[PDB]
Ligand binder design. Structure first.
Ligand SMILES: *[C@@H]1O[C@H](CO)[C@@H](O[C@@H]2O[C@H](CO)[C@@H](O)[C@H](O)[C@H]2NC(C)=O)[C@H](O)[C@H]1NC(C)=O
Length: 1008
């Protein structure tokens, strides 16, 4: 008996080229044992002549071509199945073009080979149990090597009797046993199926060694609408993109789910191909069989049997994958890994979750419940179960998060809620923006995408302003969300090439400037845009020009800082944001918690009511004039004021004819007066009290395209509707906070004002533009002063407190403490003090070899107390081989300094002042080349001007040594607040600066 266990990845191989089979008669016998539904038992020959016998989804297939039109048979499972693990028999006989296939010896089928050929000629190879590629050999219906046991295999023809089961065992120099081996039976088989529990979970796979041809099959099961199943790329091509030379192009293929839809992706070196693998959505939570067969340019993709044609563009046949292939998602931060833009799910971090079994690569079963399964993958499990409890009953999403019933898990969509995290349990961080702050995520490498999900929540009082924006250093491409006249406006600009579009936009929402929070969600899939504010109905648009790919280097909020190529941009935001989410990154939170280091900003975290760049008008009569209001089609004004005065003109701008617009305070109440060609109207803003109670008020005044005017004061809307009128430009400059003295005597009809505004304006928004009231003024009158808090503090005789130097800044004075021996903002706190006690000590600063200073002017100050008569406090030496040094010492109870910059030594000594005394003294030394000066405490400055040839550079400074041990005169007392050319040497030492060594008896003091 000749029985042999076919391991799966093993097969027999006979060489017929020394004695060709070619025959008119012939006959084929064997018994088979298999659990599996497909597998090649055997095959011989190439082109037009072959004979091919194998199990095809549970039935015995047989193909014969004698040279001109095959005979195909597929004998059926009558009473039970063939994949039963029991023995079954095959007899195949053939007389000329006549074929009979017998099963177990009684399930016959008869037919003919086509046309007139009768000669089966094959001089290549005779395969048993599998092959180098099964989906290739001619007439194959399967693509699978055999798993299980084969018995008593024989091909008798009229001439020779190739008895293959026997010749393989007894050993023949014409029989090649390619891979594995195994020669008994009663040996069983099967391989486990697998569950990928989490998105991020993935299995790493052995290189698909494709080429011209390759095939793949596996089974899947899930209720997850989106996810990346299989993916693999080649090596980076020298053939660049025209538009994106920055974008790494590679050969590849992927299989992917996207909204329950199955998808195949191939790129072989010229253009991609996307294929709906099946019409119906496949996230049925039902098993599906997936064959993928490819042959150079063409191939088919098969779902439960239903095959779909493809041909990839261009003439590239080879699909050149190299190295690792991936199943169920991608790793994070594998360098070398390149995500091609065409593959949506890779770039949206939708790793697959669900079940996968029975994997075959080029015909060969790879078992997975081992793969990197027993090889330490996290979030993958042995068997595959479907938890009948619907997990969103678990009731798991907090705070009105939306719950999605997943695979074996629920998912939360926290986007609209102010929370994040698996269960919306984490409060989401708020960034707050006052019109001159930004928060900019600089991606660590450059993104290229064809598809996004972006959401964010904002609130603002302003009808305009940027929400979020992606930007490139290399072009003006951008995906951007912004407030535009109260609506949210999505803009998707993709830029040029071809020449010898416009922007594409959506709008959603109205009046979102109410200072309540709104959620905005953008989905892009290629040319499709979908935008949607809050719960309202989604607004959709198809983009038109056939570019889809978007390059970005940053995601920007607040200010658009990267705008090299735009001479103009949406205006800076003022309000708050929260829950920025961009292909699932929560950048605001990541940034705040420091989970990412590439986030850069000057927004402030946490919410606060904003007053944005407040400006003071000191006297009524002070006013500025700005360039003309630009209310084209609609108008949205906003500002805040704070005043103690009952009446003044606040905003005036006039037009052609009787046209004008005014905003004024009258007897405490706010009045918006205007005439747009139908005569003057007054609308009184609504409040019970006078508004000059020295608090900030918000004022918001707007005319829309229906001519509905609205005046809002703090929380109170007043609306009125006025006459339909060709809306016309204004003409005069735009005056704020008064007008020229002479003008009030002739302002329009119902304008009360005879005097300007006194008080503060802030957050001034003129129909989309945030002027800097002081800086953008065209001219000015009287005093407009920055801030809302009177003037900056200015320097006084007594301002700094230890001979600190008082310097003026724009926001009040500072004290330069450098030459005092002190610290703190008024030079009044003790400088960093070290106590040098008995037996000596030493703090050394050592410059790193290349930052060795070489100066023409030095200055050094330090504070000290000591009883000593002889001591070296501090010394600075040049590096090994040069003369130059500077040394502050106490010789004969008197403080002094000695230095050499390449000529003579120069001494300078405070001769008269007691300093070894026990009391605190400070000494300040300066030097300019040859000349130097010395001063202690309050003693007149001592100046030294050498005559003759002085060199001037203290060359290559290498160490500052404090303490005296080197120069053998240890210091003993207290050294405090030493400053040398910019270095605060003791602050440095008290902070473990790596270039500081401390040795010996020397202690850092406490503070108060
Ligand atoms: C060292 O000190 C002297 C003395 O004041 C400086 O020499 C004078 O420089 C001034 C301009 O500041 C000239 O008008 C004089 O002609 C110079 N007088 C002398 C005595 O030469 C000198 O420049 C200082 N040198 C350095 C390098 O700081």
């Amino acid at each position: 008996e000749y029985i042999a266990t076919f391991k799966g990845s093993e097969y027999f191989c006979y060489d017929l080229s020394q004695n060709p089979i070619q025959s008119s008669s012939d006959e084929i016998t064997l018994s088979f044992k298999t659990l599996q539904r497909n597998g090649l038992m055997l095959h011989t020959g190439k082109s037009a002549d072959y004979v091919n016998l194998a199990l095809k989804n549970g039935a015995v297939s047989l193909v014969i071509n004698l040279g001109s039109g095959a005979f195909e048979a597929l004998v059926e499972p009558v009473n039970g199945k063939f994949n039963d693990n029991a023995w079954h028999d095959v007899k195949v006989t053939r007389n000329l073009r006549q074929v009979t296939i017998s099963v177990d010896g009684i399930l016959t089928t008869t037919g003919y080979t086509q046309e007139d050929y009768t000669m089966l000629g094959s001089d290549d190879f005779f395969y048993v149990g599998g092959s180098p590629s099964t989906a290739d050999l001619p007439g194959s219906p399967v693509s699978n090597n055999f798993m299980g046991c084969l018995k008593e295999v024989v091909y008798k023809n009229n001439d020779v009797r190739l008895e293959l089961s026997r010749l393989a065992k007894q050993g023949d120099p014409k029989m090649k046993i390619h891979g594995v081996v195994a020669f008994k039976c009663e040996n069983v088989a099967t391989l486990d199926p697998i569950t990928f529990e989490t998105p991020e979970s993935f299995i790493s796979l052995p290189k698909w060694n494709a080429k011209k041809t390759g095939s793949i099959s596996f089974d899947f099961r899930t209720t997850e609408p989106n996810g990346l199943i299989l993916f693999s790329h080649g090596k980076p091509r020298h053939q660049k993109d025209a538009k994106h030379p920055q974008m790494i192009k590679v050969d590849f293929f992927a299989i992917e789910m996207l909204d329950g839809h199955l998808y195949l992706l191939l790129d072989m070196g010229s253009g991609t191909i996307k294929i709906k693998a099946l019409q119906k959505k496949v996230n049925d939570g039902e098993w599906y069989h997936v064959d993928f067969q490819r042959d150079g340019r063409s191939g088919t993709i098969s779902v439960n049997t239903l095959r779909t044609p493809y041909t990839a563009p261009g003439e590239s046949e080879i699909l050149d994958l190299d190295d690792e292939l991936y199943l169920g998602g991608l790793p994070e931060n594998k360098a070398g890994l390149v995500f091609p833009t065409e593959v949506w799910t890779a770039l949206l971090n939708y790793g697959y979750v669900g079940c996968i079994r029975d994997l075959f690569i080029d015909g060969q079963s790879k078992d997975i419940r081992q793969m990197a399964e027993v090889q330490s993958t996290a979030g993958v499990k042995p068997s595959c179960s479907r938890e009948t409890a619907k997990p969103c009953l678990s009731n798991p999403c907090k705070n009105n998060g939306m719950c999605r019933d997943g695979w074996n898990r629920y998912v939360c969509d926290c986007s609209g809620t102010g929370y994040l995290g698996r269960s919306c349990e984490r409060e989401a961080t708020v960034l707050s923006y006052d019109g001159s702050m930004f928060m900019k995520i600089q991606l660590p490498v450059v993104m290229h995408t064809e598809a996004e999900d972006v959401s964010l929540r904002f609130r603002s009082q302003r009808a305009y302003g940027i929400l979020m924006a992606t930007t490139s250093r290399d072009s003006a491409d951008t995906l951007r969300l912004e407030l535009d006249a109260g609506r949210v406006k999505l803009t998707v600009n993709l830029d040029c090439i071809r020449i010898n579009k416009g922007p594409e936009t959506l709008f959603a929402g109205y009046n979102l400037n109410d200072n309540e929070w709104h959620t905005v969600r953008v989905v892009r899939r290629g040319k499709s845009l979908k935008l949607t504010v809050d719960d309202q109905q989604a607004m959709t648009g198809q983009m038109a020009g056939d570019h889809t790919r978007l390059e970005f280097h940053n995601i920007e909020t607040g200010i658009i800082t990267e705008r090299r190529y735009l001479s103009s941009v949406p205006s800076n935001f003022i309000g708050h944001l929260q829950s920025l989410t961009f292909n699932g990154m929560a950048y605001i939170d990541l940034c705040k918690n420091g989970d990412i280091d590439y986030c850069e900003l000057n927004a402030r975290f946490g919410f606060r009511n904003i007053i944005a760049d407040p400006v003071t008008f000191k006297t009524k009569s002070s006013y500025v004039a700005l360039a003309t209001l630009q209310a084209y089609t609609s108008m949205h004004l906003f500002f805040q004021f704070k005043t103690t005065s009952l009446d003044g003109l606040i905003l005036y701008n006039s037009g052609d004819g009787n046209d004008f617009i005014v905003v004024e305070l009258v007897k405490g109440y706010l009045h918006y007066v205007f005439d747009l060609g139908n005569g003057a109207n007054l609308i009184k803003g609504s409040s019970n009290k006078p508004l000059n109670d020295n608090q900030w008020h918000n004022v918001m005044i707007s005319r829309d395209t229906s001519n509905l005017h609205t005046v809002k004061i703090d929380t109170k809307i007043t609306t009125q509707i006025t006459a339909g009128a060709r809306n016309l430009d204004l003409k005069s400059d735009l005056y704020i906070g008064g007008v020229a003295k002479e003008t009030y005597k002739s302002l329009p009809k119902l304008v009360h004002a005879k005097e300007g505004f006194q008080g503060c304006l802030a957050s001034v928004d003129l129909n989309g533009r945030l002027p800097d009231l002081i800086s953008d003024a065209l001219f000015c009158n009287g005093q407009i002063e920055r801030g809302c808090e009177g003037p900056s503090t200015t320097c006084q005789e007594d301002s700094c407190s230890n001979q600190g130097v008082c310097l003026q800044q724009w926001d009040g004075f500072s004290c330069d403490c450098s030459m005092t021996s002190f610290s703190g903002p008024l030079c009044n706190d003790p400088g960093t003090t070290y106590i040098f006690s008995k037996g000596g000590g030493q703090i050394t600063y050592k410059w790193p070899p290349n930052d060795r200073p070489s100066t023409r002017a030095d200055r050094l100050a330090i504070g000290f107390s000591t009883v000593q008569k002889e001591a070296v406090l501090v010394r600075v030496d040049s590096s090994s081989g040069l003369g130059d040094y500077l040394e502050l010492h106490i010789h004969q109870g008197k403080i002094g300094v000695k230095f050499n910059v390449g000529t003579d030594d120069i001494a300078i000594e405070e001769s008269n002042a007691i300093i070894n005394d026990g009391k605190y003294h400070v000494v300040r030394f300066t030097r300019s080349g040859g000349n130097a000066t010395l001063q202690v405490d309050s003693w007149p400055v001592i100046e030294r001007y050498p005559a003759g040839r002085q060199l001037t550079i203290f060359n290559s400074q290498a160490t500052i040594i404090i303490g005296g041990k080197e120069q053998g005169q240890p210091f003993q007392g207290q050294l405090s607040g030493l400053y040398y050319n910019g270095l605060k040497v003791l602050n440095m030492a008290a902070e473990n600066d790596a270039n500081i060594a401390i040795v010996g008896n020397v202690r850092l003091v406490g503070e108060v």
